[PDB]
Amino acid sequence: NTPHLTIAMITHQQPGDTFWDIIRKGALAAAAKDNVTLKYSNDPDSTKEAVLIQDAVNAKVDGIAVTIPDPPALIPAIKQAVAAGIPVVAFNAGIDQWKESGALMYFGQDETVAGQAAGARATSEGFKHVLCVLQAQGQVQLESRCNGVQQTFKGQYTKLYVNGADQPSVRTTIAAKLKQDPSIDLVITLGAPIAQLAIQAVKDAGSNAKIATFDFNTQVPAEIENGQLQWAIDQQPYVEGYEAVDSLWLYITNGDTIGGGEAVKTGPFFVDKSNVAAVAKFAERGTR
Ligand SMILES: O[C@H]1[C@H](O)[C@@H](O)[C@H](O)[C@@H](O)[C@H]1O
Numbered sequence: 661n662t663p664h665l666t667i668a669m670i671t672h673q674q675p676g677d678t679f680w681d682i683i684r685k686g687a688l689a690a691a692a693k694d695n696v697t698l699k700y701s702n703d704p705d706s707t708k709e710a711v712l713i714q715d716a717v718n719a720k721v722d723g724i725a726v727t728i729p730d731p732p733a734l735i736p737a738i739k740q741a742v743a744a745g746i747p748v749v750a751f752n753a754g755i756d757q758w759k760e761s762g763a764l765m766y767f768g769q770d771e772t773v774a775g776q777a778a779g780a781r782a783t784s785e786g787f788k789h790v791l792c793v794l795q796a797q798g799q800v801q802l803e804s805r806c807n808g809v810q811q812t813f814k815g816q817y818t819k820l821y822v823n824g825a826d827q828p829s830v831r832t833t834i835a836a837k838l839k840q841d842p843s844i845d846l847v848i849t850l851g852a853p854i855a856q857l858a859i860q861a862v863k864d865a866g867s868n869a870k871i872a873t874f875d876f877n878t879q880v881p882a883e884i885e886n887g888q889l890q891w892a893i894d895q896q897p898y899v900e901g902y903e904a905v906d907s908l909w910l911y912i913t914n915g916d917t918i919g920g921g922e923a924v925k926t927g928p929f930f931v932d933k934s935n936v937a938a939v940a941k942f943a944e945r946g947t948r
Contacts, residue, residue, distance in 0.1 A: 665696045667908055668716035669725045669901070672709055672753065673702040674796070674825055679851055679875055679897060683752065685947050686901030687725070694909040704796070706733035713737040716746075722912060723747045725904035728754025728761070729799040735761050747911050751904040752897075753801035755923050764911060765919050767903045769895040769927035771801050775808020777928060778848060778872070778893065785890065787846040787870070788815040793834060795824025795854050802850050805874065809848060818844065827857060834861035844869050852877035852892070859888050876931075876948055881940035884933060894939070895927035898947055 669687055673680035684700060691698040699721065701712045706729065714737055716724050724741055728734050728750055735757065741748055742762035750758035751767040758766040782790055790813050792806040810817045820837050822830040838844055838861060847862065847869050849855040855873035862869050872890040873880065875897070883889040903924065910916040918924050931939055942948040 662695045663913070665694065665722040665909065665912060666699065666719075667691065667696050667723045667725060667905055668699045668701065668712075668719070668721045669904060670709060670712045670716065671700075671702045671727045672704050672706065672729045672799070674704045677824065677851070678853060678877060681946060682897040682948065683901035686898035686903075687905045689898075690902045690905035690909070694906060696905060696909065698905065706730035706798075710734055710737040713741055717741045717744050721746060723749065723908035725749050725751055725908065726763070727752045728757055729801055731757040731800060738763060747908060749904050749907050751900045753799065756800065756804075758923075759921065765907050765917055766923040767900045767907070767926055768801075768923065769925060770923065771804035772808040774874070774893055774895075774928035775805040775810075776812045777808075777930075778805070779809040779812030781891070781930065782809070782846055782848070782872070783812065783814040785846075787813075789818070789841075789843045790815065790846045790848060791818045791820055791837065791844045791869075793847060793849050793854055793858065794819065794821050795830070795850060797821055805850055816843070822854070824851070824854065827853070830854060831857045831861050831864070834858050835865040835867075838862060838865035838867040838869055842867065846890070847871050849873040851875050852880050855880065855883070855889060855892075859883065876939065876943040878944050878946060881936055881943050884931065884936045885940075891930050891932040893927065894929045894931055894948070896929075896948070897926075899926045
């Protein structure tokens with residue numbers, strides 16, 4: 661009936677980072693409709709993610725969907741895949757670097773803009789000293805968020821790196837930082853799982869800081885409703901994974917692209933007490 665395609669989706673997912681389950685539900689929903697076999701692979705070591713790109717080039721996949729958190733480490737392998745005639749789409753990380761690579765399209769949110777928006781919003785909500793919590797080092801999409809907050813937040817700014825792989829350590833490290841500096845009045849977490857740890861850290865520390873986050877998980881909607889989280893920034897991972905796949909299907913079958921040489925935006929969008937009801941059920945089933 662229809663042509664059968666094999667698409668490699670290659671990411672930087674740390675094992676156990678549930679954000680990537682929503683990316684994958686989107687990608688499989690596209691793949692189910694487009695007669696695609698989806699090969700999903702990941703490694704949080706960018707040298708190892710490069711090797712995964714090579715594996716898919718050598719396997720002669722029909723397309724590659726790839727994340728670019730560490731451009732120096734990944735661009736050369738992406739260029740190699742393009743020179744081998746395999747179409748590539750970038751998503752989630754690397755919005756500033758995908759076009760140079762020869763990647764055809766990009767799906768995600770402009771993380772500098774989302775950070776700039778979060779800094780201005782935080783200033784408007786009366787906060788004076790923000791702590792931005794980053795769960796990995798050397799990831800452009802995370803650094804952009806924090807740099808953007810620093811640009812627009814009028815008050816004091818502090819960054820804290822935590823090991824996203826060791827949840828109990830994340831919790832104690834955040835609580836310690838809050839106890840040590842009670843002037844911190846807002847913690848912005850860069851993922852929903854880290855948000856959970858921060859909410860608990862604030863209680864542990866006896867701090868008065870509020871918490872805001874990037875992304876949803878199953879717990880975030882309730883947390884916005886009950887005041888545990890000020891707001892969450894939605895980047896629509898389901899859309900990112902879905903479009904990574906479906907866009908390759910449009911290119912391969914009809915030569916089409918989406919975005920005209922610029923990224924296709926999946927966010928940012930701020931969800932707060934005023935609009936959370938529209939998302940909650942979907943977040944609570946893991947598809948937002
Ligand atoms: O907001 C998410 C979250 O921080 C994930 O942990 C990370 O792997 C993704 O790149 C990012 O888009």
